[PDB]
Amino acid sequence: NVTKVKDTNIFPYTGVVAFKSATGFVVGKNTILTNKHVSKNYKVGDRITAHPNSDKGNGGIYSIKKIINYPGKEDVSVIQVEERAIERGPKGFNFNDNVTPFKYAAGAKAGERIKVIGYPHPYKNKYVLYESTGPVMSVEGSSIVYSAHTESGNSGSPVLNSNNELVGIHFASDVRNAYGVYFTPEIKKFIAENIDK
Q1: How is its activity regulated?
Q2: Active-site residue among 77, 132, 142, 155?
């Protein structure tokens, strides 16, 4: 099922950020992940909003300071933001006080239930977070395939397991199956190198 997120300012939803019409999520200090197909539309200096709710409340508005695409076929891009918010969140100006990074799941298997969390319906200045659930269909190398309903606004969605641990990043749907990048060692390493320090 696909359900509107009741509280966008508690964990794990405090790990999600909104671009104008796609999603990303927090991986470390001043650092978010999304798809190359989303960040190709952005530039350094553009804004993202941390965990917005329906009614103009959020974890602050932050300016992108760097965009680092993963060198590989996989649809993964690292975005760093300026630590000091353009507009403060409720925990003040510092990005890192307002958001919560995810931790990697140990792995994932066909049959297990995952959640895809993002913004599948856009609006005139209104972000609504949804959570979509469904079983994993397979995992091979850097591909994780899941049957859970998504829309183009889910570009860049974290994919989480039952325990809210990170199993992949959503990038594509059909038309049915939807497709995320699974975090292989090679990909985790590029992310670790490129998290702000």
Answers
A1: Maintained latent until the signal peptide is removed by signal peptidase.
A2: 155
**Which domain-ending residue is among 50, 69, 102?**
102
Give the tokens for residue 42.
């952005």
Resolution value in angstroms: 2.0
Is the separation of the CB atoms in 161 and 114 below 8 Å? Answer: yes
CA distance 43 to 125: 20
How would you label 121-137 residue by residue, b for 16+ Cβ within 10 Å and e otherwise?
eeeeeebbbbbbbbebe
Contact 34, 26 (CB under 8 A): no
Q: Report residue 79 CA to chain centroid gap.
A: 11
How many whole angstroms separate alpha carbon 154 and alpha carbon 168? 13
Q: Helix, strand, or coil here: 39?
A: helix
Give yes or no: 143 in active site.
Answer: no
Q: Write down the catalytic residue from 39, 51, 75, 170.
A: 75
Say whether 196 is catalytic. Answer: no
Residues 75 and 130 in one domain: no
44 vs 66: CA distance, rounded Å: 6
Tokens of 146: 């899941």
Q: Is 155 a catalytic residue?
A: yes
Q: For residue 176, what are its two tokens?
A: 């049915």
Domain that holds residue 166: 1-8+103-197
